[PDB]
Structure 1
Amino acid sequence: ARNKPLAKKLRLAKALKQNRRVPVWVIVKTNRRVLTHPKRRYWRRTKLKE
């Protein structure tokens, strides 16, 4: 929305920062056992809890 409160904006910012892929160096360090995390999200498909 055009008008937002700061607390909601900060929570949305935290979710935005969370939504990213696993580092490639993490993948090689873990030997391909860790390839993803449960916080991956698609804006038009998976909606935020808020």
Structure 2
Amino acid sequence: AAQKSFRIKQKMAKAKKQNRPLPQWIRLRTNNTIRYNAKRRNWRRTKMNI
């Protein structure tokens, strides 16, 4: 919040990383069933509660 604890900054870093589309090669795997990334987050829609 413009002056952070490292605990909060770390979690912020992990959330950034998790925020990417489904790596499209996984779709090609044998017996693959994952169509898309069903856990995509967005700051303007769902707040991540610290």
TM-score (ref. length: structure 1): 0.76
1:1-50 equivalence runs, <5 A: 1-29=1-29, 30=32, 33-50=33-50
The sequence identity of aligned pairs, in percent, is 42
More helix by share: 1
Which runs of 5 or more residues in structure 1 are unaligned?
A: none
Q: 1:36 to 1:49 in 2, by over 3 A?
A: farther
Which structure is richer in relative contact order (CA contacts within 8 A, separation 6 or more)?
Answer: 2
Count of matched residue pairs: 48
Structure 1 stretches of 4+ with a deviation exceeding 6 A read: none
Which runs of 5 or more residues in structure 2 are unaligned?
A: none
TM-score (ref. length: structure 2): 0.76
